[PDB]
Write a protein that binds this DNA or RNA. Structure first.
Ligand code: MG
Ligand code: MG
Lengths: 244, 244
DNA sequence: AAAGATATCTT
DNA sequence: AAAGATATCTT
């Protein structure tokens, strides 16, 4: 499948390669920093050619947002079936010691899931799947060595700010949790679990429909959630009683 | 001085080098994406080496934040002058055409400038200068970036997502404006002017003390600002009224 | 303008 | 946890 091939390519590529810096056309190389803003950018750039390569093999068109505040990172679709689009979003997070619990922010809950055309490349209803390619890296302490420039002949000497990158591909709804992933930027939070749980998809929602409904009626502040629902249990009781 | 040296170094380096992709230890080069998040990250990484080079040359220790959401990008100081720290923050924005007005987001106005230690590496009072290194780049007309990899031989054939870059170093207060830079993330907005004005430092505040007082008393919503002040004029009128 | 999107972190 | 930081954009 497009899915199996994509995950095989990512898993494979992720083990045989290591990004160590940005290069100038003049051949000068600049080291990488240890914070997620940097690694997030790197993993996205890294994944681009792989996604494109695998998509092409299955006859899929790949499109990136034309504007900045638009989801998803990649929109795939065959010319003959425009209303069956696949959204692929790359998400990153870090861990301090391998095998700790991790969590991701899964996108806003007040944009395209509530308004079919808000901050999204194509109307939400034209997508049949929302895939998350999650990267987890163990953070490494920045040393003095990563504060100078390098030359092409020194590629092997440049220190990396990450240690053990792990990658997975999973449907957004499957890994979605019941607590917000951010306050003022109102993001959906993922389950807070170990990497294997994301790969295996041991989430809390029974269906994508339950996921959507939960997040479409989630109130922005605990104050507003006090009389409604603050988690999946309370949401199910709320549903049972008639949504009141 | 440290400041003049840093400014000279920034002009040269930037005038001599153009970043075109990220590179793996194995020599494989991945091209840059077009979205602002990418360039914001690249310019920050492009500057680290320069800042560290000039800092060492002047007896200054350079420190980056441990927590990822702490200001500033770089804290410079002599071990002998602990309470004479300099803060440097890197900001970027784009222009579609080389001579349009630009503006930057300059950091929050509700964190450390109101609460001396919130989200800052060292207490605000230990800093005696706050510089902003701003990069302005002109986007390219094409909305479609390259989706294949390149090798060291092809450096000259990799398309760049930007057409031209300008940089400047200036004190934060000198270029601060009176309108917020962001809403839910409560950022200070800078003046909305031409590149030349940021270089020359043609701001709106009469002093850093005014800049600080203005932003320490600015309200989050226009509803609350309407009974206080919404711009420099109204703020000055608010001072006359007795700050009520 | 002003408010709220885009991604992720911290306590 | 929930709320509010980190950059910067868009409408
Ligand atoms: Mg930084
Ligand atoms: Mg900064």
């Amino acid at each position: 499948s497009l899915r199996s091939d994509l995950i095989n390519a990512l898993y494979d590529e992720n083990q045989k390669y290591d990004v160590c810096g940005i290069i100038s056309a003049e051949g000068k190389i600049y080291p990488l920093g240890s914070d997620t803003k940097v690694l997030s950018t790197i993993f996205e750039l890294f994944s681009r050619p792989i996604i494109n390569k695998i998509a092409e093999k299955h006859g899929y068109i790949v499109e990136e947002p034309k504007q900045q505040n638009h989801y998803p990172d990649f929109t795939l679709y065959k010319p003959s079936e425009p209303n069956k689009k696949i959204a692929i979003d790359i998400k990153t997070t870090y861990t301090n010691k391998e095998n700790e619990k991790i969590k991701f922010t899964l996108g806003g809950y007040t944009s395209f899931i509530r308004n079919n055309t808000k901050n999204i490349v194509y109307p939400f209803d034209q997508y049949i799947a929302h895939w998350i390619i999650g990267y987890v890296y163990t953070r490494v302490a920045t040393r003095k060595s990563s504060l100078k420039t390098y030359n092409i002949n020194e590629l092997n000497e440049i220190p990396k700010p990450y240690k053990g990158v792990k990658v997975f591909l999973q449907d957004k709804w499957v890994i979605a949790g019941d607590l917000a992933g951010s306050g003022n930027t109102t993001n959906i939070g993922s389950i807070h679990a170990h990497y294997k749980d994301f790969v295996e998809g041991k989430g809390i929602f029974d269906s994508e429909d339950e996921f959507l409904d939960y997040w479409r009626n989630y109130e922005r502040t605990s104050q507003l959630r006090n009389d409604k629902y603050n988690n999946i249990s309370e949401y199910r009781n709320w549903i049972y009683r008639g949504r009141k």
